[PDB]
Amino acid sequence: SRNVDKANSVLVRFQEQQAESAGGYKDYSRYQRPRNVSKVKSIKEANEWKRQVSKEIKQKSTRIYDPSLNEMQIAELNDELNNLFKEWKRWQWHI
Amino acid sequence: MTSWRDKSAKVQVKESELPSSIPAQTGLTFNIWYNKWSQGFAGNTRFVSPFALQPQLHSGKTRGDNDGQLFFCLFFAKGMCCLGPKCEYLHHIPDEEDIGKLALRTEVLDCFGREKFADYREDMGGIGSFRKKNKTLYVGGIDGALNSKHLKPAQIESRIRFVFSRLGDIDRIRYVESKNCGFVKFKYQANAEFAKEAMSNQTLLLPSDKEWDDRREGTGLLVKWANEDPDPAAQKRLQEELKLESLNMMVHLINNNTNSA
Amino acid sequence: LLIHRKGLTYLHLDYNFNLKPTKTLTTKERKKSRLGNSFHLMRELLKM
Amino acid sequence: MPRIKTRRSKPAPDGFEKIKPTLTDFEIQLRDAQKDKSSKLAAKSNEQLWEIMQLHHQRSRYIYTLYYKRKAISKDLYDWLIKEKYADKLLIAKWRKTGYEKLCCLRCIQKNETNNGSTCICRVPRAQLEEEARKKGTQVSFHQCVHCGCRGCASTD
Amino acid sequence: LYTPKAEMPPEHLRKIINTHSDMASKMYNTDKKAFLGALKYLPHAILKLLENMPHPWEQAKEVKVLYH
Amino acid sequence: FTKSELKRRRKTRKGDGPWGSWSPKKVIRNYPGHPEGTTALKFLPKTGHLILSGGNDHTIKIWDFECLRDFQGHNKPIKALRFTEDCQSFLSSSFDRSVKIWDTETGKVKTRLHLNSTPADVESRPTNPHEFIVGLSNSKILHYDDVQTYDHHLSSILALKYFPDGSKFISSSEDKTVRIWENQINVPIKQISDTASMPFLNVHPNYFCAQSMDNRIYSFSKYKRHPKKIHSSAGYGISLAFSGDGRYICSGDSKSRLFTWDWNTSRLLIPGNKPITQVDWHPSKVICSGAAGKIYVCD
Amino acid sequence: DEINEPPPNICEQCLGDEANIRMTKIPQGSECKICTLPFTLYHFKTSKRSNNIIKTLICVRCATQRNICQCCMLDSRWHIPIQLRDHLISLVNEENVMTEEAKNDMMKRFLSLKNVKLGGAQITSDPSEADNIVDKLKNILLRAYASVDISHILKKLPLNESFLKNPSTKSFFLYNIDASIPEWKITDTVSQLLGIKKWKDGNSLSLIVNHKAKCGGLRFQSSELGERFVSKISETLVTPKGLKRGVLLIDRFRIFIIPWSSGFSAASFGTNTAENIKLSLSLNKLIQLELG
Amino acid sequence: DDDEPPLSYEQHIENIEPLDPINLPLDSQDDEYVKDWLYDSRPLEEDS
Ligand SMILES: [Zn+2]
Ligand SMILES: [Zn+2]
Ligand SMILES: [Zn+2]
Ligand SMILES: [Zn+2]
Ligand SMILES: [Zn+2]
Ligand SMILES: [Zn+2]
């Protein structure tokens, strides 16, 4: 079984849940957007969320200019770059 | 003399008041060999120094003054020395008398006694190289230092001129607003090595500002070693002072051949 | 200290000298954390 | 014969109850000196080792002045304190020599510990150290030795 | 020019062991190498400990030790 | 050199020689000595040299931070005790329907405040104004001149605090409300009823307060809690303490809502008797009164 | 060869003045600073009662190829750094001599095992080839922004007032400062003039110089020092309208002064680098108007 | 238990009276020559 299975087991989840309650872990490399921005919390928390969005920007931006030869995919890639751009701004308003 | 030789050096931080030796938890399990945190990501790991040097307050005679110590206390510069007057190293701003003692010694190692290296570190941080007598510091990371006050482009330079003037004789201070960074050049390298460790991870706030209670929450400013100055208005100054250094050495060197004959 | 110098912080050495993994291990970790006879035979002497 | 009061251990002689409250004060300071006070400096960590060698010295100067200087305890008590390890047998035995009167410890006279074949510098008289520093034009650089923190055991000072 | 070994107090050993509980400081970097390079001598320390084990008619047993 | 000189120079040493110079939380201490349970605890605000601990035996025992003195003079259980900053005064309040002042200098009762209807469970000293704030089963707050009566809470008032700026009185009651009081107009400025009895409050030394309940400790300008079964104290280090009646000491950070430690006290030489009734920090230590008849010191 | 190894190359001034020095040999001590490859660490102390251990930082092969000592890494003859040595020989042979060094670890090791000399290490270690170049050094000694709106700033610079005794001010305005002439050299020249030496202890004077605007100001604490700064300056230049200006006199340079009569602060000179260059360009005319 | 560390000698062990060991009673009329010294650590160590 691939490490996708081994990473999501109960014990690995348990110590992250302690590290939330004992320190400054959590990472944020784990979780989603989260769907709303007005429901987000303090800024020092959100800066790491915002930093994560920059990193998928850099993956997408490096992916745009390639000769993948797929006009549909690069159209899709410009769409995520545009939504992550609009996403990068909504955290700035939240900041 | 009146500011320094008159009094004795004072305990900056109590030994119970010293920070904990384990770092802030950025991982799941602590590692005992490498005193760091292992599992989990790596988060951040730069914080504002809780301590700072008040140079006219903390300076004084130490145990290293009577012993003829050449080297300055590293934790005096950080504002963290718990030994006070019982410390083996010096607790004062370097002067021409002090750097004259270090003159045979500064070539390979800094004013704090730490040995220099062949080439610089990749981010220009650290101790320094013995191949270049670098006397210019890159004052960077000012935004986290100010705690994101807008202040301006001149005020920021005023903070840099006030703080680094206490740490020794200055050749020049240049602030660049577009690059949001400063370049401080000292008269001696030993002041630049002292002021680098003194102003690493500090904050340019002063109390006269509202954020003084939140000075700890920020990131802290980076003092690192500076690169060469690329404008030819300064490049011509470099070969001019290198020319004067060469003429001052040839006079000293023909007297060696005069004595040798 | 030997376990932790090798970076094997996911292995817990008990006070009764039992060596147990703290989590479900990836394969690069199970290759890396495969201690030899001289570690375990030293560990079983200390258990005795 | 041990430190622990075992049943193989011999009961105390007559004069022990007079000197027992003094010996307990040296005993409770040794338990507070071994307490693991966590200090991060190496200049402070050996300094806590220097307090133990001081108290083991001061517990042994006490029994030395009881028996050899003031003759205030019996030989059967003084032999009992050595067997029960209240006093260092070999450290007292150096204090009886003419040159080793105020002997730091036993480690500061080992010729084999040092890099040279020399004693510790706390064995040197202070007026000898002032004389050599006077020719060098400086103050004397020695304050406390690394073995136990002494400041001069020379018998002349 | 040989004098014998100096017979330290028992508390001098005892403070050292207690001090080396939490080796988190930078001062312990040399002493961590000393713990790790002593691991080859540790089977000799187990034999000398188990051969001097107190027999059933003994409450306690003072042994003479050599310590780093 | 000479023998008389070396005899003189060896007396220059400060000692005699050879060492004379030529030049989480844990439990540190347990303190017994109250005959009954200990209800309230306050500390000297200037020097930190002493405690003032109430009791269920009607006495007050001043503990050294040893037992210094005993202050009798109440007929019933002393629910609250508060020490003044700018004055050398001690305001104690008990179940005997009286707020009694104490001159710390001579150790005698100076003043008795009157006209409470029933047992007075809270005293808080206003900082600047030389006022007293008392609250009780009267369901009203009385502002005493060391004048104003505030009505609103529909049940008994458990904890009361004072602050210099606006909303000068924060109050908490068993109608599960927390009100912020405008004392000059003598009416409510703001109502915070989000608790589902609020038995404890504590002021952060950030201009905020920490509000307690049975299972949820909130803050007011949350905290992650499972069933803790119910005092609060705020260190200057951010850490926020929570006393439980299930013996559990819930330590928390105030910024986060995070809970970093949960401890369990050892009862005594009954298992139901092991709660923590009151708690306070110094001006790096924690001093907690328990119903097992002991004061415990947490380091 | 591990059993046949050269003796260490250390300076005479590293060893110091004493005759017998007890030196400690460790056969594979640290690794070299240059080649990152192990060697025999020698370390020693100058006197017996010293407090500084002098270690050999580089191996003997890296010390031979550079012709430097192992401890202080200065040249064995002439006792100068390498960067100054290869610059002095470049003034003699009229070509650049330079020891170049690897930044790669496999080429730091490679460059050390070869038996060549590097840079000026052919010239030095030959006493005949060194002494004639010193003679060739001796013949060298026989030779021995128009778009900017700057008008908000020049109202605050004085530029129209005179350097007399009669105003009693703390601050002054120094213009005509070259891009050379460090900030320490102007405070030392003023403190030499007043005898208020070691001024940084008492903070008697505070000086701000831009080095882009070619202008600056120096503020005194204790206004009675201002009359000492006026009276200790003798030479002045009178502009042909009037309005006499004192000259500070750094070696070969001339720096003009006018009492500010208020505190200038930072940012009086400029708030942007492009903006400060035009103030030096603004002044250059007034200096030429003051002199000629 | 393997979770609890080896408890320190001085806070726990050293302060307590040890126990009685295994000793046969050694009848005095039949064993008078050995009963004074049989159960020592080193028997007759200081007898010259
Ligand atoms: Zn220091
Ligand atoms: Zn000594
Ligand atoms: Zn000693
Ligand atoms: Zn010694
Ligand atoms: Zn090399
Ligand atoms: Zn050298």
Side-chain angles (χ1 to χ4, degrees), chain A, chain B, chain C, chain D, chain E residues 2-68, chain F residues 1-24 26-27 29 32-35 37-40 45 47-48 53-57 59 61 63-64 67 73-74 77 80 84 87 89 92-94 96 98-100 102-107 109 111 117-120 124 126-127 129 134-135 137 139 141 145 147 149 153 156-157 159 164 166-167 171-173 175 177-179 181 188 190 193 195-197 199 204-205 209-210 217 219 227 230 232-235 237 239-241 244-246 250-256 260 265-266 271-272 275 277 279 283-284 286-288 290-293 295 297-298, chain G residues 1-277 279-292, chain H:
Chain A
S1 66
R2 293 177 177 89
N3 59 358
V4 176
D5 291 331
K6 295 180 179 181
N8 298 317
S9 67
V10 188
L11 283 78
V12 182
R13 291 182 288 171
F14 177 73
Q15 293 106 25
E16 294 177 355
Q17 281 156 335
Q18 283 182 349
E20 298 184 354
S21 294
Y25 195 58
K26 80 176 42 179
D27 337 298
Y28 289 151
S29 66
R30 295 294 180 92
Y31 306 111
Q32 74 282 25
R33 301 163 284 177
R35 188 176 177 87
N36 197 359
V37 150
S38 67
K39 300 296 286 185
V40 185
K41 298 301 290 183
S42 69
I43 171 175
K44 61 176 183 65
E45 195 274 333
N47 282 317
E48 296 174 351
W49 292 106
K50 189 182 75 173
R51 182 183 292 171
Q52 190 192 9
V53 176
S54 157
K55 304 188 295 185
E56 295 104 15
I57 279 292
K58 192 177 264 76
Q59 293 182 359
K60 262 60 183 297
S61 296
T62 51
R63 194 185 286 272
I64 285 173
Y65 286 96
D66 64 354
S68 285
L69 300 174
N70 288 316
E71 290 183 354
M72 185 269 288
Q73 292 295 106
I74 63 98
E76 184 72 24
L77 292 173
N78 197 2
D79 290 332
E80 290 106 14
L81 174 133
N82 284 316
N83 72 24
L84 291 165
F85 276 174
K86 298 183 176 69
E87 222 182 16
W88 177 268
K89 291 186 284 183
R90 62 194 283 181
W91 263 278
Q92 285 178 345
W93 284 7
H94 176 268
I95 285 167
Chain B
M1 184 67 205
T2 306
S3 294
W4 176 57
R5 286 180 182 88
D6 195 2
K7 67 181 74 174
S8 68
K10 12 209 35 33
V11 176
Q12 288 172 343
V13 180
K14 274 76 179 174
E15 66 178 359
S16 65
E17 184 64 27
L18 289 174
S20 179
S21 64
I22 55 98
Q25 182 177 2
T26 64
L28 200 275
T29 61
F30 193 43
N31 192 2
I32 297 171
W33 198 279
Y34 299 102
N35 292 319
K36 290 178 184 294
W37 291 92
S38 296
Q39 264 76 114
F41 77 176
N44 241 115
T45 196
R46 294 185 65 248
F47 58 95
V48 170
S49 175
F51 328 127
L53 176 62
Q54 264 114 260
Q56 71 272 15
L57 181 64
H58 297 293
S59 299
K61 299 291 287 185
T62 181
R63 194 190 294 280
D65 280 322
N66 290 317
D67 295 334
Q69 183 68 43
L70 298 177
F71 295 151
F72 295 94
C73 181
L74 183 60
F75 303 98
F76 175 73
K78 295 181 176 65
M80 293 175 69
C81 188
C82 69
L83 295 171
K86 300 296 183 181
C87 181
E88 293 291 330
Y89 297 105
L90 304 181
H91 290 77
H92 56 100
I93 295 99
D95 192 73
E96 294 181 352
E97 184 176 0
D98 302 322
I99 301 163
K101 293 182 176 66
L102 289 168
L104 297 173
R105 189 81 275 182
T106 317
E107 179 69 27
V108 302
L109 53 89
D110 61 355
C111 65
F112 298 108
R114 298 175 297 171
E115 297 171 354
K116 292 191 283 186
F117 287 87
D119 50 353
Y120 289 100
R121 189 178 167 86
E122 179 66 30
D123 56 355
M124 293 299 113
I127 300 167
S129 175
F130 58 88
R131 299 187 184 276
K132 183 178 178 181
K133 293 180 183 180
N134 195 358
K135 295 188 287 184
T136 304
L137 293 172
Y138 173 73
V139 179
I142 300 174
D143 49 357
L146 297 176
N147 292 319
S148 296
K149 290 177 99 291
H150 159 124
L151 292 105
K152 256 264 188 38
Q155 291 55 82
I156 292 171
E157 184 178 0
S158 178
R159 310 297 213 44
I160 291 173
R161 290 184 188 273
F162 181 73
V163 175
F164 288 95
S165 69
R166 298 180 298 173
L167 297 176
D169 295 332
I170 291 174
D171 208 39
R172 67 185 67 252
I173 295 171
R174 176 72 182 274
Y175 180 69
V176 179
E177 170 58 25
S178 70
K179 296 292 183 181
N180 198 5
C181 70
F183 293 96
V184 182
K185 187 177 181 183
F186 288 94
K187 183 185 188 295
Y188 293 103
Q189 184 179 0
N191 293 113
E193 294 162 349
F194 184 76
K196 179 178 182 293
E197 295 295 326
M199 289 304 293
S200 299
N201 298 117
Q202 294 293 323
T203 68
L204 343 69
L205 288 271
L206 325 202
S208 348
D209 295 342
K210 62 180 176 63
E211 297 87 357
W212 185 254
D213 291 331
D214 289 330
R215 57 173 182 168
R216 187 185 294 268
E217 293 180 352
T219 303
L221 66 97
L222 289 82
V223 172
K224 298 188 291 183
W225 291 103
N227 298 113
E228 291 180 353
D229 198 355
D231 51 346
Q235 293 291 323
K236 291 174 95 288
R237 299 182 298 178
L238 261 297
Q239 293 103 27
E240 185 176 2
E241 291 179 353
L242 181 61
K243 185 261 293 179
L244 182 61
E245 181 65 31
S246 298
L247 268 72
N248 288 316
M249 185 54 69
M250 290 185 285
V251 174
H252 177 76
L253 190 56
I254 61 168
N255 289 321
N256 197 2
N257 205 171
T258 301
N259 292 318
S260 179
Chain C
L1 199 57
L2 180 64
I3 291 168
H4 283 183
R5 189 183 185 274
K6 293 173 74 74
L8 306 178
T9 61
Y10 50 84
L11 293 176
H12 185 76
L13 198 277
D14 283 327
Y15 290 103
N16 289 327
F17 295 96
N18 291 315
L19 184 63
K20 294 174 184 179
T22 61
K23 68 183 181 68
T24 305
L25 300 186
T26 67
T27 315
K28 192 177 263 76
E29 289 174 349
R30 283 194 292 111
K31 293 185 174 75
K32 179 67 69 177
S33 70
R34 188 169 299 123
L35 276 308
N37 287 323
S38 68
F39 183 82
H40 290 292
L41 202 276
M42 195 62 218
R43 184 184 59 82
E44 296 294 328
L45 262 297
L46 290 175
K47 185 187 287 186
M48 186 187 80
Chain D
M1 294 299 292
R3 172 70 75 194
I4 301 172
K5 182 67 176 177
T6 63
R7 191 173 61 190
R8 297 292 93 193
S9 178
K10 184 179 182 293
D14 194 5
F16 179 71
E17 295 293 326
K18 186 180 290 294
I19 65 170
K20 186 178 179 180
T22 59
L23 295 178
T24 307
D25 291 332
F26 292 105
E27 195 273 336
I28 62 170
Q29 291 176 358
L30 287 173
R31 293 178 68 251
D32 292 333
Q34 71 197 10
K35 188 59 71 177
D36 190 8
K37 297 185 290 293
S38 66
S39 66
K40 66 171 70 174
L41 276 76
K44 294 290 179 68
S45 69
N46 57 1
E47 187 176 0
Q48 295 178 356
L49 291 171
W50 293 348
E51 296 294 327
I52 296 173
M53 298 299 291
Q54 185 177 2
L55 295 175
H56 180 75
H57 177 81
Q58 290 175 357
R59 189 178 66 187
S60 294
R61 295 290 297 171
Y62 182 74
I63 302 170
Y64 180 72
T65 58
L66 288 174
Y67 183 72
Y68 291 102
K69 296 295 183 182
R70 200 169 63 244
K71 268 68 184 299
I73 61 170
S74 69
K75 185 178 184 293
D76 292 329
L77 180 62
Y78 178 71
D79 291 332
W80 181 74
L81 295 175
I82 293 172
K83 294 180 177 67
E84 297 288 323
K85 298 290 183 182
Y86 289 98
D88 195 359
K89 178 68 173 179
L90 299 175
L91 181 60
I92 290 173
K94 295 291 183 182
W95 294 342
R96 299 179 66 189
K97 278 94 173 68
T98 286
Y100 296 165
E101 297 289 334
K102 293 180 181 180
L103 183 45
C104 200
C105 38
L106 295 174
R107 191 176 179 182
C108 284
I109 57 169
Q110 297 292 109
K111 298 289 184 69
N112 299 115
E113 294 282 320
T114 60
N115 292 318
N116 292 317
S118 297
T119 61
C120 184
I121 194 169
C122 67
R123 295 295 306 161
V124 178
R126 183 72 173 172
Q128 184 65 42
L129 291 176
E130 295 293 327
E131 181 69 28
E132 294 294 327
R134 186 180 298 276
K135 293 181 175 67
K136 298 297 289 182
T138 63
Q139 291 84 17
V140 56
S141 177
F142 176 65
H143 299 286
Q144 284 174 349
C145 72
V146 72
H147 298 292
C148 43
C150 174
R151 285 166 169 168
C153 350
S155 302
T156 188
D157 57 3
Chain E
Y2 180 77
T3 58
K5 183 62 73 176
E7 186 66 29
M8 289 296 108
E11 294 87 4
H12 183 273
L13 169 62
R14 181 179 290 171
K15 178 68 173 180
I16 291 172
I17 160 40
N18 292 319
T19 305
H20 289 287
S21 297
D22 48 355
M23 300 174 74
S25 175
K26 189 176 286 293
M27 64 174 284
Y28 295 101
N29 285 321
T30 305
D31 296 334
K32 288 175 184 179
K33 293 182 180 183
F35 286 13
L36 199 64
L39 188 59
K40 61 180 180 292
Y41 293 152
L42 192 62
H44 198 278
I46 294 173
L47 182 144
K48 301 299 287 185
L49 180 66
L50 267 70
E51 72 177 359
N52 284 306
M53 177 168 66
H55 299 281
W57 55 86
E58 290 178 352
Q59 296 182 357
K61 209 153 152 297
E62 293 289 326
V63 297
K64 182 178 285 184
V65 300
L66 189 69
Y67 61 94
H68 191 267
Chain F
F1 246 107
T2 61
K3 293 181 176 70
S4 66
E5 181 69 29
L6 296 169
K7 180 74 172 180
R8 185 179 294 112
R9 291 181 66 249
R10 75 186 70 186
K11 299 293 185 288
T12 310
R13 299 179 72 183
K14 303 287 104 175
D16 56 350
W19 287 267
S21 67
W22 291 94
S23 84
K26 65 183 181 181
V27 180
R29 188 171 293 171
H34 294 286
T38 170
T39 299
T47 284
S53 294
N56 200 3
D57 60 347
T59 63
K61 294 184 184 293
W63 294 96
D64 193 355
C67 182
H74 288 286
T84 176
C87 295
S89 296
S92 66
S93 64
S94 173
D96 59 353
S98 67
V99 175
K100 291 187 184 294
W102 294 95
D103 194 1
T104 292
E105 294 182 356
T106 296
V109 290
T111 306
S117 296
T118 60
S124 181
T127 340
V134 53
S137 297
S139 299
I141 306 166
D145 197 1
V147 172
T149 302
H153 281 308
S156 297
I157 295 169
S167 265
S171 64
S172 70
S173 61
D175 62 355
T177 67
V178 169
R179 283 183 170 90
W181 291 94
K190 184 68 177 176
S193 68
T195 292
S197 178
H204 189 273
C209 66
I217 302 166
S219 179
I230 293 149
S232 294
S233 293
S239 171
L240 174 65
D245 288 335
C250 183
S251 296
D253 186 76
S254 176
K255 293 289 197 290
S256 50
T260 71
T265 58
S266 179
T277 295
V279 62
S284 295
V286 180
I287 298 96
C288 60
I295 297 170
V297 290
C298 294
Chain G
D1 290 329
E2 68 272 13
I3 65 171
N4 295 115
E5 291 176 354
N9 192 3
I10 311 170
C11 286
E12 184 184 359
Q13 65 181 357
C14 299
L15 267 54
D17 293 333
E18 289 83 3
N20 195 1
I21 295 168
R22 182 179 176 87
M23 188 177 291
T24 299
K25 191 266 296 297
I26 295 97
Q28 289 175 357
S30 181
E31 64 184 4
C32 183
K33 294 291 185 181
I34 297 171
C35 68
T36 69
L37 196 66
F39 66 100
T40 64
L41 195 144
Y42 294 91
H43 66 85
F44 66 100
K45 292 169 70 175
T46 63
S47 67
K48 185 67 179 295
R49 290 298 99 205
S50 177
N51 52 0
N52 291 319
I53 295 171
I54 300 173
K55 292 169 68 177
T56 59
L57 298 175
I58 59 172
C59 64
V60 66
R61 292 183 290 112
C62 288
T64 300
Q65 291 177 355
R66 275 79 175 177
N67 193 7
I68 54 177
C69 87
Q70 297 182 3
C71 292
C72 77
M73 286 190 280
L74 298 178
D75 189 9
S76 296
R77 191 182 293 272
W78 300 352
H79 299 287
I80 57 174
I82 300 171
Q83 192 277 131
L84 186 59
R85 179 186 67 190
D86 297 336
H87 186 269
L88 289 177
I89 301 171
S90 298
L91 266 69
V92 172
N93 293 320
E94 294 292 327
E95 64 185 1
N96 47 357
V97 289
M98 180 182 72
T99 170
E100 63 183 3
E101 288 85 3
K103 286 94 172 66
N104 302 115
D105 289 332
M106 295 299 291
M107 180 55 204
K108 284 180 180 178
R109 299 171 185 173
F110 183 82
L111 187 147
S112 67
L113 270 69
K114 64 177 72 175
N115 289 316
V116 301
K117 299 292 181 69
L118 295 175
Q122 291 90 14
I123 286 95
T124 318
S125 67
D126 294 333
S128 67
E129 297 293 325
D131 290 332
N132 54 1
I133 291 179
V134 178
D135 299 332
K136 292 181 181 180
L137 295 174
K138 190 182 290 183
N139 296 117
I140 301 170
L141 269 300
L142 295 174
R143 301 279 75 78
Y145 291 98
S147 176
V148 67
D149 289 330
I150 206 165
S151 66
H152 285 173
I153 291 94
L154 274 78
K155 299 298 291 182
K156 299 285 102 177
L157 304 180
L159 301 178
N160 297 114
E161 287 83 5
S162 63
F163 181 70
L164 267 295
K165 180 263 295 178
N166 301 118
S168 63
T169 72
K170 289 181 185 291
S171 297
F172 294 93
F173 172 64
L174 319 177
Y175 70 105
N176 199 0
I177 296 167
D178 287 337
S180 181
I181 185 154
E183 184 170 356
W184 61 265
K185 193 175 288 292
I186 306 166
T187 60
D188 288 334
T189 305
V190 173
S191 65
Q192 184 65 253
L193 188 63
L194 297 178
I196 197 67
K197 81 282 191 186
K198 291 183 183 293
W199 60 272
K200 59 99 175 180
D201 293 333
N203 295 114
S204 65
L205 56 93
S206 177
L207 189 141
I208 296 171
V209 163
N210 197 4
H211 295 285
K212 298 295 286 184
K214 292 179 69 175
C215 295
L218 104 119
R219 300 175 270 128
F220 290 104
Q221 284 244 356
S222 86
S223 299
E224 54 89 17
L225 292 176
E227 289 87 1
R228 294 183 69 248
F229 182 72
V230 169
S231 181
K232 263 64 186 298
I233 294 172
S234 180
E235 185 67 27
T236 58
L237 286 178
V238 178
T239 301
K241 188 66 184 70
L243 279 307
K244 58 179 72 175
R245 311 293 179 87
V247 296
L248 205 36
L249 203 346
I250 288 51
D251 53 354
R252 294 180 60 84
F253 305 120
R254 304 180 80 187
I255 292 178
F256 304 101
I257 52 176
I258 351 81
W260 200 286
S261 180
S262 70
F264 50 96
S265 324
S268 172
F269 320 121
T271 317
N272 166 38
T273 187
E275 201 276 331
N276 285 313
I277 296 169
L279 195 146
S280 68
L281 292 173
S282 175
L283 275 202
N284 289 320
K285 296 181 178 68
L286 185 61
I287 294 163
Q288 293 177 356
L289 286 170
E290 176 175 355
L291 274 74
Chain H
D1 190 72
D2 50 354
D3 292 332
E4 58 186 1
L7 44 90
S8 68
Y9 177 79
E10 297 86 11
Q11 295 173 356
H12 301 283
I13 288 99
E14 188 181 2
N15 293 318
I16 197 62
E17 179 73 29
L19 247 92
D20 287 332
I22 300 172
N23 286 323
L24 194 68
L26 292 179
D27 181 75
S28 65
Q29 281 75 242
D30 289 329
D31 297 327
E32 71 273 19
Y33 290 105
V34 303
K35 71 182 185 294
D36 292 330
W37 55 269
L38 183 63
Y39 299 122
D40 294 332
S41 65
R42 291 182 181 93
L44 299 174
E45 182 182 1
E46 68 271 13
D47 197 0
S48 296

Coordinates of all heavy atoms in Angstrom, one line a residue, chain G residues 32 34-35 59 62, ligand 5:
Chain G
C32 N 41.7 21.6 6.6 CA 42.1 22.8 6.1 C 41.0 23.8 5.8 O 39.9 23.4 5.4 CB 43.0 22.6 4.9 SG 43.8 24.1 4.2
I34 N 41.2 26.0 3.4 CA 41.3 26.2 2.0 C 40.9 24.9 1.3 O 39.9 24.9 0.5 CB 42.7 26.7 1.6 CG1 42.9 28.0 2.2 CG2 42.7 26.8 0.1 CD1 44.3 28.5 2.1
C35 N 41.6 23.9 1.5 CA 41.4 22.7 0.7 C 40.4 21.7 1.3 O 40.1 20.7 0.6 CB 42.7 22.0 0.4 SG 43.4 21.2 1.9
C59 N 46.7 23.8 5.9 CA 47.7 22.7 5.8 C 48.9 23.3 5.2 O 49.0 24.4 4.7 CB 47.2 21.6 4.9 SG 46.8 21.9 3.3
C62 N 48.7 24.0 1.3 CA 48.0 25.2 1.0 C 48.9 26.4 1.5 O 48.7 27.5 1.0 CB 46.6 25.2 1.6 SG 45.4 24.2 0.7
Ligands
ZN5 ZN 44.9 22.9 2.5

